Design a protein around this ligand. Structure first.
Ligand SMILES: *[C@H](c1[nH]c(/C=C2\NC(=O)C(CC)=C2C)c(C)c1CCC(=O)O)c1[nH]c(C[C@H]2NC(=O)C(C)=C2[C@@H](*)C)c(C)c1CCC(=O)O
Ligand SMILES: [Cl-]
Ligand SMILES: [Cl-]
Ligand SMILES: [Cl-]
Ligand SMILES: [Cl-]
Ligand SMILES: [Cl-]
Ligand SMILES: [Mg+2]
Length: 150
């Protein structure tokens, strides 16, 4: 079924993603029609909370960024505590443990399905060009598989 096929692909993407970046967490964050995200798959290193199966409503995507991410926007943040974020934003990440993050889009049938997100949990991390390119290509490849499989 479509549901069973998707999950296996999500698991591949998060496993490969964390291997490529050797970071603390990679997730697939999938949007519903409210642009509320669910963590549908996760690969996480020892000692960190499991973000799997969390529903996280963050209005900034629908209110500002969905079309930009469809067009290939990313977020690369070396230190989330120096990114001028509000407490609301910091509060949603604190249960997970995020000190640096890399967010790339998953676009299927010209719509923003979700985001493929990498975390470093306890130290800043400048994401390098080759890492961003690798991770962006992973998410784009996985998205295109999903787009073509059914
Ligand atoms: C936009 C915004 N949110 C996120 C969210 C995440 N980062 C992650 O690692 C994860 C998975 C755990 C999530 C989810 C990102 C990356 C961005 C930036 C998008 C960009 O510019 O590309 C954002 N959301 C908030 C939350 C805040 N705003 C509200 O209205 C309410 C309510 C909030 C608390 C829930 C903030 C402050 C931003 C940044 C400013 C903006 O884009 O509006
Ligand atoms: Cl969903
Ligand atoms: Cl938009
Ligand atoms: Cl744009
Ligand atoms: Cl482009
Ligand atoms: Cl088909
Ligand atoms: Mg199709």
């Amino acid at each position: 079924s479509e549901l069973r096929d998707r999950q296996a692909i999500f698991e591949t993407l998060v496993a490969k993603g964390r291997e490529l970046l050797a970071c603390d967490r990679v997730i697939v964050y999938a949007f519903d029609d409210n642009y509320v995200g669910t963590v549908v798959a996760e690969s996480v290193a020892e000692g960190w909370p499991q973000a799997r199966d969390q529903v996280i409503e963050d209005p900034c995507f629908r209110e500002h960024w969905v079309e930009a991410y469809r067009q290939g926007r990313i977020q690369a943040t070396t230190d989330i505590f120096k990114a001028g974020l509000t407490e609301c934003h910091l509060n949603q990440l604190r249960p997970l443990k995020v000190r640096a993050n890399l967010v790339v889009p998953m676009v299927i049938d010209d719509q923003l399905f979700g985001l493929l997100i990498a975390h470093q949990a306890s130290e800043p991390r400048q994401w390098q060009e080759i890492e961003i390119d690798q991770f962006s290509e992973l998410a784009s490849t996985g998205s295109l598989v999903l787009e073509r499989l059914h």
